[model samples]
Target chain A: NSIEAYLADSREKVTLGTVVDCFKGKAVSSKVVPGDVGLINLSDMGTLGIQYHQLRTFQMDRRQLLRYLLEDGDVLIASKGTLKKVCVFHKQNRDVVASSNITVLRPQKLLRGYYIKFFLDSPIGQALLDAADHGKDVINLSTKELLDIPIPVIPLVKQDYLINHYLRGLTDYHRKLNRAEQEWEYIQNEIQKGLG
Target chain B: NSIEAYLADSREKVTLGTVVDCFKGKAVSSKVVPGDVGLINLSDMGTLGIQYHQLRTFQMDRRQLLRYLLEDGDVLIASKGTLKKVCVFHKQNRDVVASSNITVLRPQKLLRGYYIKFFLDSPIGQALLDAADHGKDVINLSTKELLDIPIPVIPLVKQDYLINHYLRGLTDYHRKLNRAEQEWEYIQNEIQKGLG
Candidate 1:
């Protein structure tokens, strides 16, 4: 019902593959020494963009690295376990690449990464992803199924507004969460002082 | 090292039992009709007070219910799995009671429920709770060990400040999280409208 409902409309809905280059991430060996390259695993996806808390070291061929190397505005979708988690990547100081558990979507000029991420992170997006799970034991989203999902075309102005609103809202969430942590820390220090 | 470090200082540190009435909650049977009584299990506790999304229904003897009925300013500590989660209860429209998996603490005049919650929800507090786990199969915090844990005595002025700070911080966190949810919702609706 959900998948049917989402597809019921007769507007210009482009297949994801038509507007973006989608591919499964590589499964690099975990034995590499700590290096400049950071691996984006399932753990990196969260309510916020990415968590680099335990970003693992990775290595890849210089020639092939360019294809997998993440850039600003890259959209990452979890293909295993937690299918609903999605985020738009913004490159940091170090180079990062998605792992085997992710599907990387590089949008063309017509679409924005954040806009695609917003759709993938919604209830309808989740339903589409859930319908793709064909794992016998573990949950998984097939790259083929992922590439076939429809994307609604919106005005650039409205798309930019949605993207900006998401970014601003997440930024504010981080601020408030940080403030809460600081207040809790203050409480901890005060209690420790009382014990002295 | 943490346990000893927490106990090293003794500037008016009193056992929790001395300042609060603590007890294990009752394990009511599951077969009960939907009624006014709401059963608070581990799911009810979260980052911002209680979550009543699926608050279960229960029934108890009218005479015996008085002692178990949750009051405003009551603190709940998870005694089973995920021992770190704790919250201070604020009575809502219906009657509420803690499930057997939780430890309820009714503070005396010298202590506040939120103040105690703040301490118990801290790093050191988590350390104390972790040390109390003695179950061979599953994680469990013994009520006896919980009551014996020491609580630091602070000036009421500063104590009130810590409590107020925590409340304010959580209130802001909720606001930001709500804002983020609304933004995501807006993006979803925008995408849906584009499909019309």
Candidate 2:
């Protein structure tokens, strides 16, 4: 949690492309039932809940899963939506993967996951999403187009202030939110437990 | 606790009736009077929870406050906006008033507060709100418009089934989210604790 560790002296005006590559998720086939890898499609992104339980089996492939698999601090975006919806996977519970419509962006060593997600959800970030809109009916946001978009680069000192203050303030809330999400099913089942 | 106590024999799409009244709240002064009776305005309806802080001090009058005061089980809606937002006041920690832009609908003998709020936030209910839309810029909806809107009548058996199952599912998650919100403040305070 030291700011000194992540800083690089001054600032650099870089595109989001430079910070992290925009890569689409996989299309692990449906030749399977409910099993190992949990999939995060547009449906899962449709809630205030972060962690979800709608895991289904994928066409088994070690290297593919490894390549497509998301790690902690990874940010996921539903590239087809009209909203700037983003979700972060902070905890690795039973291993999860993203669907084809989702773009999984790994927060770089120098960048903060929460802050990046926050920016993407901000109005300006959403503007880029709006600017990148494509197709009819179900619009798509290409990772190639997104790769070239400019990012407002605030210096690390101010960035550190955010990490130390704003994000730090959100730390417990995020943890609690995640904890609550994990406890959702448990509490739901508990409702009918002793009521009978 | 029992569904047998509330259900009618069969279907009847009736008026909201004495079961509920579509009434708007009072118009408090648009002046700077902080640390006063908390007020839920058109803007405030944008958020979820109803027990919001930062209430304005009314032009000090018990009669005025009492007229607009909110109580537990009271559901509120923004009657002036395009979006059909519904908020439930299940708790009464302090004296709060709803602005004139909001319609305060009290749950009646046969109706449930959560159920009413749920319905208002639902598709059909929202359609009624949209249908009643009048005016430009800041659109308007009348209690007369809302009062006449036909609500789907179902046996209390079916209502209870929905009431029990649907509300219970959302209950735990809302509680968890609130806990997370509280923890958010705690974490925020903790972050700045040792630093400054």
Which is the leading candidate under TM-score?
1
Which CAPRI level is candidate 2? incorrect
Give residue B61's error in model 2 in angstroms: 2.8
What lDDT score belongs to each candidate, Candidate 1 first?
A: 0.76, 0.64
Candidate maximizing DockQ: 2
List the lowest-lDDT window of 10 residues for candidate 2 chain B: B1-10
Clashing pairs in 2: B36-B57, B38-B55
Q: What does candidate 1's lDDT look like per residue over A92-131, in tens digits?
A: 7887888988889989866788878767766787788777
Q: Which pairs clash in model 1?
A: none
- TM-score for each of the candidates: 0.62, 0.46
Q: Each candidate's chain A: what TM-score? A: 0.91, 0.70
Two-chain DockQ for each candidate model? 0.13, 0.19
Chain B TM-score of predicted candidate 2 relative to the true chain B: 0.73
